[PDB]
Amino acid sequence: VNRCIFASIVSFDACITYKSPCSPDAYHDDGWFICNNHLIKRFKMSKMVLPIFDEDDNQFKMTIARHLVGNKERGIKRILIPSATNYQDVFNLNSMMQAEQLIFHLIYNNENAVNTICDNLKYTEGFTSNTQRVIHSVYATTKSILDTTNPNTFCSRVSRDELRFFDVTNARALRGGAGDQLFNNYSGFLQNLIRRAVAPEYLQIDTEELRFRNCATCIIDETGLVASVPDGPELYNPIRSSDIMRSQPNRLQIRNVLKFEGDTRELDRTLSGYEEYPTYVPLFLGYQIINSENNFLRNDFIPRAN
Amino acid sequence: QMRVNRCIFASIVSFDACITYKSPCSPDAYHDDGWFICNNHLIKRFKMSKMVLPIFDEDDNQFKMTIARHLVGNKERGIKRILIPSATNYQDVFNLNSMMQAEQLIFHLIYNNENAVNTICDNLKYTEGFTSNTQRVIHSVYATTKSILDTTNPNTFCSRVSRDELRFFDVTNARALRGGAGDQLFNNYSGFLQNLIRRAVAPEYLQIDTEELRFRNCATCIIDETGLVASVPDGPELYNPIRSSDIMRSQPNRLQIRNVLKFEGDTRELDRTLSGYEEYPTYVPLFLGYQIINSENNFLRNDFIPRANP
Amino acid sequence: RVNRCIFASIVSFDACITYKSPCSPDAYHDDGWFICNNHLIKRFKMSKMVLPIFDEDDNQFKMTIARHLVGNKERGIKRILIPSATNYQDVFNLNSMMQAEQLIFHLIYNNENAVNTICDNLKYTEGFTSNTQRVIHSVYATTKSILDTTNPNTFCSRVSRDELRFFDVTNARALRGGAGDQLFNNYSGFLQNLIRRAVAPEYLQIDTEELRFRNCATCIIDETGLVASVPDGPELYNPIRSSDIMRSQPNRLQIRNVLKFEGDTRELDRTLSGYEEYPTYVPLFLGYQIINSENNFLRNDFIPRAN
Amino acid sequence: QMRVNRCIFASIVSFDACITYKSPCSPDAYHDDGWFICNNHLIKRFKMSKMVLPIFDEDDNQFKMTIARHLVGNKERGIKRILIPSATNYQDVFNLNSMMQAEQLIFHLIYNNENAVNTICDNLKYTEGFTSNTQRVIHSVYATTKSILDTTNPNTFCSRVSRDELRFFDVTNARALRGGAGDQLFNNYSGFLQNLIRRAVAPEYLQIDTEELRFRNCATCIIDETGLVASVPDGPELYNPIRSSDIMRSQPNRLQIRNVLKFEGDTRELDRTLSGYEEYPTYVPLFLGYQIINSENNFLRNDFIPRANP
Ligand SMILES: [Zn+2]
Ligand SMILES: [Zn+2]
Ligand SMILES: [Zn+2]
Ligand SMILES: [Zn+2]
């Protein structure tokens, strides 16, 4: 079963049918409820797994995502997951079909906009005995996923052993900060997506710290989950092509690429049979505590509530 | 060829890309007569049927004239008697809300209501699947309707007008080349509606070369403010049963209440007694007004021309 | 064919007493009744029936109705057929209704507090997260889905509006309601649909003409709820159609006084058996239903009706 | 398909019922390229040629826009420099009362001159053979011209209009989304002529989302009260050597005195010395104004839509 939230994007008109392009990872029961293709298209992130090894033989993999924000980009083009008070500006929902707009409105709990879409679609002819049950299928699937990830849904089993503080100052004191308050403000599905994409900088398991990176690559500010380093210039993150070129093919866009000139093949062969260190930018931020007694190694998503 | 659907309502389609709809149109829709409407739609919307009034010359040389019979029961009163509503009350007489938007657009064009058609424009432009293919179909419907209207509008550019014929719907001074209040009301109608009224409502009198042929001695309809209405100018309304109608299929999910009249006696033997006799039909034709054919004229023409008002 | 009765789920929350609720076959007929005849009888003291309205030539159409199962000798909370949202926990003995039935009942009356209390109470059990979490979630999901089906305010919930139904027939001819209708509006969408299904209108104005079916209501809508008492005089004789109805708990001991007739009625039996029978019963007649000139009153698929 | 003639002047046909006429529209008339005028008719009437301006980027992608070179000699002065006359001076620039009928009717419609076209109808109606061919041909010409104009008039019912493009001809405040006197005059123009100016006159600046591409450093045309004119906003006019042979011969009988220019001296050896190098054309393109492409746009769209300003 497709678990990508954006799997329900269809055309409210009956004739044209649109099976949204979803990567094969959509059907996996991983913590994610979004596919890699859609995560790239909308939240401009790529899914990856961070494997943590012990000393002798045991490796457990956590999830992580790498953002796709160029260093040159600035402003509203750096936010990966916008906040509910600015998302309608970062996302150009107007040019996003109608089903995608409905899903986005539901993700951010904008029932008013959803009802406006409802009214607009009720006015048109061929809605009652046609578009109805189609908008209903979209809404039902989206709400099902959102309540699956919402810990407050009725009788919704919620994990509570593990804690996640996106502010590392007082994390060892068992307490978050302003970023953590903003995180709590988010919708359950968005909170889960952030907890998946953004790996914790520190990992306190059984009182043992396992600091992974020495500096956070992202920040949770008011604008949202920004792909900005809190020190000096932004990280060089080259993105080549063929990820979102599905964008309207008639939309003429300019792009300032940065090419290297010169023969690199001799240098390449000089040092070729070496393990290559990847140059992506992972999403590292915050602190995660496993709390000794727990069930961290459970192969089934359960909502995590701080 | 002359076998194009000339019924104005032939363009009715679905503004969505599904639910393909072929508007039920009677065969007469393809005939090049001046009706510009099919019998099926004439019955369904304007509740009239397409008859023909043959005027016989004494020697042999008969000629025909279009005439319609209305389908208004004598029991019905109010806005249920209006056959062709005026441009003001039509939105009330016709339940435009309860019909396909294509029919609504055609109707709004028939009454020169630009605001309503533009509102339909905007409502459709608020649709996701609008620019894909619905734009082309709605534009086609508008183009066909406008073309029909220009065909019937005598004020359209290079619109040939046969002014040899004068029709007055108030026969008081019609003999004095003059109309009345009903005629002024009739002038306000759109060209298509004017032609439809002329086709449907035969004149009581016909003046040809000073010869006055009086067909009926009393009008069966009236052009009042509400529009062209099926009601006698005095006394109770004419008994008019119709039985079969468009209510068949139509709206099978809508439950409607009708009180009907029926006879409860054996009539087969009475029928057999009066079996092989000429039958006088008990319909109600639309008779009203006066019509003059000037000594010099082209009244016996085949191609329709938008006859202009007095 | 999918079970439509709202009480269809009712599954033990312990995964030990596994049993299937005794829904009657009519449970699988989507006829606007989202409850089966057996459950309607057991819980709401009503039996399903169809009221056929004939014209004078051929075309007859059917209309749902219900007969209540309240004896004339009953008084107080025993006469209430459908309790209001503020007294149901008193009329219904929800304690002796397992917990799935209690959950369904709490949802029917929008008593989310009691629903959450049931959930919190059941979270303690050591067998919770294994399977009872999912069983409770399934029951809740089915119940909420049915309620949305019958609730016209749900998102994109197509709602019929060419049909008006009042229960205080004083200004119904004025297209206006009354205190009974104000109480009716307070009900949950499912319960409003159930009342409209069970309580036939004594008047049926089909766009010009009043079809008066009964000349007095056999039920009322008061604060206590939908009640089987007559608006005037002693209650209607209703001999419970005998033991036909059911029995629930063999262990529970209860005394019932039953009116007995005496005499050899067999001779009169055939003498009148040579004739057509008029059924006594007691249908639910109350209020005024108007069908406008334009409508889809003969629409097969059920759609919620909103006043 | 490509068998419908999109040129507006294609409908030109003699109103008389005897003498035939075949408009010499160029093959380019059959392409749906946004131009609704063919290259030869553009040359004959508006004194412009049809060129394509290709804009490349550093990579292996490119896109082409339309542009036109005017055919106004440097020595021309007065109303001879006007390429597209305004609605007021057009009857003074064009010699309408010389190009028989039909073409005159199209010209009157292009400038929304209802009175003049009605007068044309009035004059034509008195002809002996009016109800014969003449009325048919005149009606066909009017219908074709009206359809062409509606295709471009953004204010037509259900007429889709693009609004991701913003075109100005005033530049001084184009960076502030605001036009000026030239833009105000441009708005007064007919929709077809607005589209024709947009096609012919390439923008001096091209601003896509945020990057500004400057094509020319000085406009070559102007939009003044007399219309779109081929005068520079500078000193002596650009030297434009008219190719006399290319320009049609029009009227063989009419005797016109033309003071042509002539270069003297042998130049074949110079050509041989400079044969092989890419030649930079000496045409004079139409550059003026400022064009903005919204970040969300459908610029690379095949089907033409009227580009009404926001
Ligand atoms: Zn996806
Ligand atoms: Zn028809
Ligand atoms: Zn049941
Ligand atoms: Zn041409």
Report the DSSP beta bridge partners of residue C203.
C288
Which among A112, A7, B123 has a CA at the least distance from the CA of C155?
Answer: A112
- DSSP tag of B98: G
Q: What is the distance between the alpha carbons of residues D190 and D188, in angstroms, rounded to a whole number?
A: 7
Distance from CA of A93 to the nearest CA of B (A): 13
Collect all residues of chain B within an 8 Å Cβ-Cβ radius of residue D135.
158, 160
Q: What is the distance between the alpha carbons of residues C196 and C193, in angstroms, rounded to a whole number?
A: 5
Q: What is the count of residue pairs from B and C with beta carbons less than 8 Å apart?
A: 26
- Whether A158 contacts chain C with CB within 8 A: no
Q: Give resolution in angstroms.
A: 3.2
Query: φ and ψ at A103, to 5 degrees?
Result: -60, -45
Collect all residues of chain D within an 8 Å Cβ-Cβ radius of residue B154.
none
Distance from CA of C144 to the nearest CA of A (A): 11
Collect all residues of chain A within an 8 Å Cβ-Cβ radius of residue B122.
none
* Interface contact D135-B158, CB threshold 8 A: yes
- DSSP tag of C277: P
* Interface contact A250-D293, CB threshold 8 A: no
Chain D residue with minimal CA distance to B116? D157
Q: What number of other Cβ atoms are within 10 A of residue D246's Cβ?
A: 9
Q: What number of other Cβ atoms are within 10 A of residue D3's Cβ?
A: 5
* Interface contact B253-C298, CB threshold 8 A: yes
Q: What is the distance between the alpha carbons of residues C109 and C186, in angstroms, rounded to a whole number?
A: 10
Buried b (16+ CB within 10 A) or exposed e, B234-262: eeebbebeeeeeeeeeeeeebbeeeeeee
- Whether A124 contacts chain C with CB within 8 A: no
Which among C84, C52, C63 has a CA at the least distance from the CA of C165?
Answer: C63
Collect all residues of chain A within an 8 Å Cβ-Cβ radius of residue B127.
13, 124
Distance A142 CA to ligand 1 centre (A): 13
Chain A residue with minimal CA distance to B120? A124
Chain A residue with minimal CA distance to D63? A252
Query: Quick one: tokens of A270?
Result: 């000089």
Q: What is the distance between the alpha carbons of residues D103 and D184, in angstroms, rounded to a whole number?
A: 28
Collect all residues of chain D within an 8 Å Cβ-Cβ radius of residue A72.
none
- Whether C207 contacts chain B with CB within 8 A: yes
Which of B95, B253, B257 is the closest to C299 by Cβ?
Answer: B253
Q: Long-range contacts made by residues B135-144, C-beta under 8 angstroms, separation at least 24?
A: B135/D158, B135/D160, B137/B13, B137/B15, B138/B15, B138/B102, B138/B105, B138/D158, B139/D157, B139/D158, B140/B11, B141/B11, B141/B12, B141/B13, B141/B102, B141/B105, B141/B106, B142/B105, B142/B109, B142/B117, B142/D157, B142/D158, B144/B10, B144/B11
Chains that touch D (3 or more CB pairs under 8 A): A, B
Collect all residues of chain B within an 8 Å Cβ-Cβ radius of residue A120.
126
- Which 3 state secondary structure label does DSSP give C38? helix
What's the Cα-to-Cα distance from A143 to each of A19, A42, A102, C118, C159, rounded to whole Å? 19, 19, 11, 24, 21
Q: What is the distance between the alpha carbons of residues C192 and D33, in angstroms, rounded to a whole number?
A: 63
Assess contact for A66 and A217: CB atoms under 8 A: no
Handedness of CA B95, B97, B98, B100 (dihedral sign): positive
Assess contact for D94 and D44: CB atoms under 8 A: no
- Whether A134 contacts chain C with CB within 8 A: no
What's the Cα-to-Cα distance from D97 to each of B90, B242, C47, D101, rounded to whole Å? 48, 63, 92, 9
Residue that is written with structure tokens 């829709």 in the block: B29
Percentages helix, strand, coil for chain A (3-state, rounded to 5) are 30, 15, 55
Query: φ and ψ at D135, to 5 degrees?
Result: -65, -40
- Distance linking the first and last C-alpha atoms of chain B: 34
Method: cryo-EM
- Characterize the bridge pairing of strands C46-53 and B290-293: unpaired
* Interface contact A14-B16, CB threshold 8 A: yes
Which of C129, C137, C156 is the closest to A132 by Cβ?
Answer: C156
Is the pair C, D in contact (3+ CB pairs within 8 Å)?
no
Query: Quick one: tokens of A77?
Result: 């083009």
Collect all residues of chain A within an 8 Å Cβ-Cβ radius of residue C115.
154
Q: What number of other Cβ atoms are within 10 A of residue D219's Cβ?
A: 20
* Interface contact A250-D298, CB threshold 8 A: yes
Assess contact for B159 and B308: CB atoms under 8 A: no
Q: What is the distance between the alpha carbons of residues D237 and D242, in angstroms, rounded to a whole number?
A: 14
Distance B169 CA to ligand 3 centre (A): 70
Q: What is the dihedral of CA C242, C245, C248, C250, to 10 degrees?
A: 30
Residues whose CB is less than 8 angstroms from the CB of residue D48 and which lie 6 or more positions away in sequence, other chains included: D42, D68, D69, D70, D71, D83, D200, D286
* Interface contact B158-D121, CB threshold 8 A: yes
Residues whose CB is less than 8 angstroms from the CB of residue B282 and which lie 6 or more positions away in sequence, other chains included: B239, B240
Collect all residues of chain C within an 8 Å Cβ-Cβ radius of residue B254.
294-298
Assess contact for A147 and A189: CB atoms under 8 A: no
- Please identify every residue whose CB atom is under 5 Å from ligand 2, which is an ion: B 7, 9, 25, 29, 38, 41
